[PDB]
Nucleic acid binder design. Structure first.
Length: 960
RNA sequence: AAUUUCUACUGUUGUAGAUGAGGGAUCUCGCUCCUGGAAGAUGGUGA
RNA sequence: UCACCAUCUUCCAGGAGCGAGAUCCCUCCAAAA
């Protein structure tokens, strides 16, 4: 399908060769210099600007008389007069009524409208509050000046006073007897009490409420204008760093940067243009020139109204501003064509006269866009010169400054696995690009950043350590931005209104035909670990159980190949006398080349190794948790350690905040256990894992049954379907704790000063830690327990702040999701190629309404956006809406992406549906299904079910 | 504890993923200090 | 029994200073001696 004007920021390492001027000025990257490839774009000198402040001031000097006309709210004349009377008080001394800003805006004589409004608001509430506390009556109220409130009904305040009274009563209960449990309880109640009171006040008070709205109104304009000012001022850098003309020099397969002083710029070009156009004399020079549709606009119009722009002065006859071109694309296009056609234009706009003439001037266009694209399409020009001795002449005369561009990839051309970003940069220079009319486009703007090496790793840690690493040094980082598929419509769905968006996206969705679909994936929502994955094909929809099972027996025909690690413990010794462990990075044992260079072994040994250490399988599901791609291979257990780190930190954070829960001076004994015995603990736990709203509807016996339904076998605790359904609805976080099944979990209960079997605080250690077999290879459970035990009491162990903890976690999350995105991308390609069609990525519709999952959602989307299978959009998380509730048939579609309802889960059998089932266990209905040689675990059945339903919903979905 | 990515693991030239860049307004909720009022426990005030 | 003082504490309201989070919009190529 089509492609998009995707924009990608990119960056490279800079090395100083000669910086006579830059070095004069020489935590994170710091801007130091900004430069452009376009000799015209430099000419926007800062001085080329007026005193914009004064004009904006015209928008701000509101008078008292207009204020009531600035609001949608309706006020009784008496209320309006009172506001005016109040304002008259405030009208004293200062006269310049303003929005409110830096005194530079309006001089100290200024008074903020917002503040005055906020003032009055505060005074009224305060006055009212103390009246309340004093215990006066309605008549008292009426005799007061509370214009905002004295209009309040006799009825209403009754409530409020009563309620107020309630707070007083409650307060003495808190003044006295100082019992925590009840005091907390009491505080809760009061909080509630206050909640509704606010509701009451907020909602039931028209004058108050109205005014509230009024204040909430005035602030919006102030906010809109303030954004403008900030933008303007920030952009309006009086001494803006943009002072250099950017050039490109190539030499010996390496590219160099050149920055020229502005003053010298002019003359430079002159000298430049006199040289030969082509050759193979080693040294080469480059520069950019182009004209843009967007610039035409700003050339043809703009300052025109100001009487400044001299271009339009000379073409007045050709014309009536841009706005005059109302509902007529043929007018603008022909207008423009004339402009171009205009020799005068041709005398100063550096354009391909011949080319423009042949295609632009000569031809007509169906729509404005078409014209636009062509313009910039052609306008983009790349110039080259061949001559030796160039750089010294530039240095000798032009006082130029030069930089070197470098990376890991650059410094070895002679290899295959180049990083994805470097392709772009490389591909840019190629002739084929030029042949295609500069498909890939370099924006004419660049950035230079400085980054002081971080102290923390310098002195005693890498410097004195004599390490190989180069973070401790000074660095110059180049920031650039590139385009893809520029020669394509700049389709934007962002700016649409309500009804508009839905139509547009639907039109988009029409691209995909129901018969084209060949396969559909599915992503489970399970929180036991990251997630689980499945795939489906329509052919599985047979008519009878026997047909379905037989079809399901063709995994050799439909499945995907996989490699599995045999022995994790496996390790070797290299040619340098150090142990390598396979588990830590399998690649060293996969890619033949690396193996040889490391271990000095022969081809046959490699072959024997390969065969012995691994296994091959074909499956219809997968464990996404640990999955990674290596050298075009899928491995379940590729990266154990990534998970491990995740959990560990997981543990660290939750435990640390538990102790740091202002647990001051109280012996909140935090005890770590592998299970829970008493009902008090169990009941105190199930609450954490259920919705309080639905929890309150359970009785004590139901609460007891719920705990048994959690911590006890459900095959013997004969709960009813309604009980199960109620429990499922109560369930908040999906999980498993069946007795001590193959995923044992810990617990971090917190006794209160002793083993008092009545009250406790228990975070589900599902937030803290879980145990898996695989980890053992890394560390022994005893070592694992000892380590974590450090957390609970060892305060000194917490030498690092949260600011680090959080970002470590956040980035750890990023890494997993990145591995995930790799596997999913790989798979998609495979099937596509294998079946010659497009598939559907169906995801459990977890959203804002209902953390990784959000992340997973996002990054997934972007990997697919470069493919153009999905619309362009503001931001996925600012899109989603209703239509995702109470329907097993519901579906939301965005391109090939789709969201559905979470009703129903693993239990539904693939074949007989109704029979509850577990992986490795035969169907209770004896339908004939088996999961022995088709899936990997229990979770696989779920991800199979979700796709099955998702595809059925998609076909059911009808635009008809 | 080799990095445009120091972002992941291993590790002085590997496997993956990386648009992102900058920036700002509004609104809520947590924690400290200040001013006034409410309201409460003592000891002196007159039976 | 009542006006004020002594003492310490709870609460609300209002103001300032500090911290976290949702939600939205913009930025990323143009001139004459």
């Amino acid at each position: 399908m089509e492609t998009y004007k995707v924009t990608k920021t990119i960056r490279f390492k800079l090395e100083a060769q000669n910086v006579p001027e830059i070095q004069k000025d020489i935590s994170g990257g710091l801007p130091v210099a900004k430069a452009s490839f376009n000799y015209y774009t430099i000419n926007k000198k800062p001085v080329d600007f007026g005193n914009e402040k004064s004009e904006l001031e015209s928008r701000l000097k509101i008078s008292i008389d207009t204020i009531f006309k600035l609001t949608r709210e309706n006020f009784s004349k008496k209320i309006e007069e009172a506001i005016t009377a109040d304002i008259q008080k405030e009208l004293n001394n200062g006269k310049t009524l303003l929005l409110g800003d830096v005194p530079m805006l309006g001089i100290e004589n200024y008074v903020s409208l917002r503040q005055i409004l906020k003032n009055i608001k505060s005074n009224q509430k305060k006055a009212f509050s103390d009246l309340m506390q004093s215990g006066k009556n309605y008549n008292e109220l009426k005799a007061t000046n509370l214009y905002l409130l004295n209009t309040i009904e006799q009825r209403q305040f009754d409530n409020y006073k009563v309620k107020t009274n309630e707070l007083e009563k409650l307060a003495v209960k808190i003044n006295q007897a100082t019992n925590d449990n009840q005091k907390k309880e009491l505080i809760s109640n009061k909080q509630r009490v206050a909640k509704q009171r606010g509701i009451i006040m907020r909602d039931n008070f028209a004058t108050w409420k109205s005014f509230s709205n009024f204040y909430r109104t005035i602030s919006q304009e102030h906010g809109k204008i303030l954004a403008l000012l900030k933008g303007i001022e920030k952009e309006r850098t009086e001494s803006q760093l943009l002072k250099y003309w950017a050039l490109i020099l190539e030499n010996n397969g390496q590219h160099k940067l050149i920055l020229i002083p502005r003053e010298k710029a002019a003359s430079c070009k002159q000298w430049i243009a006199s040289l030969n156009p082509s050759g193979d004399k080693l040294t080469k020079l480059f520069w950019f020139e182009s004209l843009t549709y967007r610039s035409l606009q700003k050339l043809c119009f703009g300052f025109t109204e100001n009487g400044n722009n001299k271009f339009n002065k000379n073409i007045q006859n050709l014309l009536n501003g841009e706005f005059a071109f109302q509902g007529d694309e043929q007018k603008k296009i022909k207008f423009y064509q004339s402009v171009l056609e205009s020799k005068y234009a041709q005398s100063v706009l550096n354009i391909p006269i011949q080319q423009v003439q042949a295609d632009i001037i000569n031809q007509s266009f169906a729509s404005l866009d078409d014209f636009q694209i062509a313009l910039e399409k052609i306008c983009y020009r790349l110039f080259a010169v061949v001559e030796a001795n160039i750089e010294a002449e530039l240095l000798k005369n032009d006082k130029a400054q030069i930089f070197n561009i470098t990376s890991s990839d650059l410094r070895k051309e002679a290899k295959d696995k180049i990083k994805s970003h470097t392709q772009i940069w490389k591909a840019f220079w190629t002739s084929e690009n030029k042949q295609n009319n500069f498909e890939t486009r370099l924006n004419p703007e660049i950035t230079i950043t400085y980054r002081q090496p971080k102290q923390s790793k310098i002195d005693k840690y890498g410097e004195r350590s004599q390490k190989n690493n180069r973070y401790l040094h000074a660095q110059y980082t180049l920031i650039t931005t590139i385009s893809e598929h520029s020669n394509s419509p700049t389709k934007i769905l962002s700016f649409m209104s309500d009804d508009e968006f839905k139509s547009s996206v639907d039109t988009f969705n029409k691209k995909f035909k129901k018969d084209e679909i060949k396969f559909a994936f599915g992503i489970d929502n399970g929180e036991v670990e990251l997630s689980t994955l499945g795939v489906y094909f329509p052919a599985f929809d047979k008519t009878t159980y026997k047909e379905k099972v037989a079809e399901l027996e063709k995994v050799n025909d439909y499945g995907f190949e996989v490699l599995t690690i045999r022995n994790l413990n496996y390790k070797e010794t290299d040619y340098n006398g150090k142990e390598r462990k396979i588990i830590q990075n399998p690649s060293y044992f996969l890619k033949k080349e690396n193996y040889l260079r490391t271990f000095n072994k022969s081809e046959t040994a490699y072959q024997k190794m390969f065969t012995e250490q691994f296994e091959k399988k074909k499956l219809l599901t997968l464990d996404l948790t640990t999955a990674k791609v290596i050298c075009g291979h899928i491995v379940t257990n590729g990266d154990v350690p990534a998970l491990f780190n995740l959990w560990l930190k997981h543990a660290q954070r939750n435990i640390f905040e538990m102790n740091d829960h202002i647990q001051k001076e109280t012996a909140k004994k935090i005890v770590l256990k592998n299970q829970l015995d008493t009902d008090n603990e169990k009941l105190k736990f199930a609450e954490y894992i259920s919705k309080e709203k639905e929890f309150g509807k359970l009785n004590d016996d139901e609460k007891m049954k719920y705990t048994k339904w959690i911590f006890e076998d459900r095959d013997q605790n004969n709960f009813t379907e309604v009980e199960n359904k109620k429990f499922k609805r109560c369930q908040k976080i999906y999980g498993n704790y069946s007795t001590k099944a193959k995923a044992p979990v810990l617990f971090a209960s917190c006794f209160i000063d002793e083993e008092l079997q009545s009250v406790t605080d228990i975070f589900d250690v599902r937030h803290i830690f879980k145990k898996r077999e695989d980890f053992y290879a890394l560390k022994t459970e005893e070592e694992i327990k000892q380590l974590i035990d450090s957390y609970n009491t060892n305060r000194a162990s917490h030498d690092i702040s949260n600011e680090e903890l959080d970002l470590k976690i956040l980035n750890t999350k990023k890494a997993l999701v990145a591995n995930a995105v790799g596997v999913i991308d790989f798979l998609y390609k495979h099937y596509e190629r294998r079946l010659g069609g497009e598939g559907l990525i169906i995801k459990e519709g977890f959203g804002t309404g209902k953390n990784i999952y959000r992340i997973l959602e996002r990054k997934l989307y972007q990997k697919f956006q470069n493919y153009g299978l999905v619309p362009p959009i503001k931001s996925l998380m600012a899109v989603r809406a209703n239509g995702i509730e109470n329907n097993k048939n519901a579906i939301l579609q965005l391109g090939n992406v789709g969201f559905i309802d979470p009703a129903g889960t693993s239990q539904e059998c693939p074949v007989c549906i109704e029979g509850r089932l577990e992986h490795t266990t035969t169907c209770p209905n004896k339908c004939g299904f088996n999961s022995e040689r088709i899936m990997h675990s229990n979770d696989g059945i779920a991800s199979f079910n979700i796709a099955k339903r998702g595809f059925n919903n998609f076909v059911k979905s009808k635009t008809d």
